[PDB]
Amino acid sequence: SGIALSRLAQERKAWRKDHPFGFVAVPTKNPDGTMNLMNWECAIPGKKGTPWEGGLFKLRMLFKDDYPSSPPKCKFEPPLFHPNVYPSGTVCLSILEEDKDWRPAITIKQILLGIQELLNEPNIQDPAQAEAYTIYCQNRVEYEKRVRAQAKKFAP
Amino acid sequence: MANIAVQRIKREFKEVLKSEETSKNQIKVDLVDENFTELRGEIAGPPDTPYEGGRYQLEIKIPETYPFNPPKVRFITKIWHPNISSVTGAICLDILKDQWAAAMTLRTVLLSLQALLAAAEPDDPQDAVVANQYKQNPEMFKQTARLWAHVYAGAPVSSPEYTKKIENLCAMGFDRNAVIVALSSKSWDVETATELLLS
């Protein structure tokens, strides 16, 4: 664990100095103190000019003791409608896969941005959620007002 | 290429192969192709300098307008020197520029590059960050250059200080080269280099 905490202490310090305006990422409290650096309450605003415009989608960001050797698990709380997001809320992505495109240098900043850029531009060949895929493959506008309405559910 | 210039290169290539400087392992040169548009050079870092024991791989290109324009020389082996780009290896040396003369062999070129390594011109810089580190803080510049000589060019090991900081940041999970660059640039202050590596 010693290794992981060190890097995360520094990750937050940098994020506190500067982040892309509008994003949230903050370590949770342990009961009595403490503070828990291996569990983060995080938030992503969908870039403007998109259907994902006007919404703020929350995700938890859990870290294993291997980190930065292993990536964080990223879970949307609650589960999100997205072809690339599992029905339990977990974001499925190459840079977030241990033995694929994760690299120990990759910052939390770049994760959250990478997820944000996964929002409007989805990865067809890689499905995580049946229902969202089923749509995107035949009737796009049904997916569109679905995204429009989902963003409308979340106050800015 | 052009008949005339081709026989020059072959003469110069032979001059270097037979030179005293090569038998004493200070410089060497090798051809690549049939075509003599491109050579491979190597120089020993000079004695009493931060680059001592280093060995530097040089990319030599010969343009269509050689001998009247100079050969295009770039450092393949990364180096911390105010008159060479720490990033691309682009060089800023008088004799490959506006002090160039057509009678200058490849031997003369290689020896001048060794000389530039023992005598910086920080008042005419290729690397802003490095030149400013040279003038404002000479001792730090000597240590920083010496570390690069060790990591990239094979020179006997450097300052405990600098390496502690590197293998501290690499233990944090960052890329060595990125780490080395950061510290070198942010003048060995951990706090600032660290915020750069995130960026």
Curated annotation (Swiss-Prot), chain A:
One of its GO terms (biological process) is positive regulation of cell migration. PANTHER family: UBIQUITIN-CONJUGATING ENZYME E2. Keywords: Acetylation, ATP-binding, Cell cycle, Cell division, Chromosome partition, Cytoplasm, Host-virus interaction, Isopeptide bond, Mitosis, Nucleotide-binding, Nucleus, Phosphoprotein, Transferase, Ubl conjugation, Ubl conjugation pathway. This is SUMO-conjugating enzyme UBC9. Residues 12-17 are annotated as: Interaction with SUMO1. The record marks 99-100 as: Substrate binding. Signal peptide: none annotated. The modification N6-acetyllysine is found at residue 64. The gene is UBE2I. Expressed in heart, skeletal muscle, pancreas, kidney, liver, lung, placenta and brain. Also expressed in testis and thymus. The record marks 3, 24, 56 as: Interaction with RANBP2. There is a cross-link at residue 17 (Glycyl lysine isopeptide (Lys-Gly) (interchain with G-Cter in ubiquitin)). One of its GO terms (cellular component) is SUMO ligase complex. Changing residue 86 to A: Impairs catalytic activity. Residues 3-156 form the UBC core domain. The modification Phosphoserine is found at residue 70. The active site is at 92 (glycyl thioester intermediate). The modification N-acetylserine is found at residue 1. It is found in: Nucleus; Cytoplasm; Cytoplasm, Perinuclear region. There is a cross-link at residues 17, 47-48, 100 (Glycyl lysine isopeptide (Lys-Gly) (interchain with G-Cter in SUMO2)). It comes from Homo sapiens. GO terms for molecular function: ATP binding; enzyme binding; HLH domain binding; RING-like zinc finger domain binding; RNA binding; small protein activating enzyme binding; SUMO conjugating enzyme activity; SUMO transferase activity.
UniProtKB/Swiss-Prot annotation, chain B:
The active site is at 92 (glycyl thioester intermediate). Induction: By aggregated low-density lipoprotein. It holds the Pfam family UBA. GO terms for biological process: cellular response to interferon-beta; free ubiquitin chain polymerization; positive regulation of peptidyl-threonine phosphorylation; positive regulation of tumor necrosis factor-mediated signaling pathway; positive regulation of type I interferon-mediated signaling pathway; protein K48-linked ubiquitination; protein polyubiquitination; regulation of proteasomal ubiquitin-dependent protein catabolic process. The modification Phosphoserine is found at residue 159. It comes from the Eukaryota. One of its GO terms (molecular function) is ATP binding. Expressed in all tissues tested, including spleen, thymus, prostate, testis, ovary, small intestine, colon, peripheral blood leukocytes, T-lymphocytes, monocytes, granulocytes and bone marrow mononuclear cells. Highly expressed in brain, with highest levels found in cortex and striatum and at lower levels in cerebellum and brainstem. PANTHER family: UBIQUITIN-CONJUGATING ENZYME E2. This is Ubiquitin-conjugating enzyme E2 K. The gene is UBE2K.
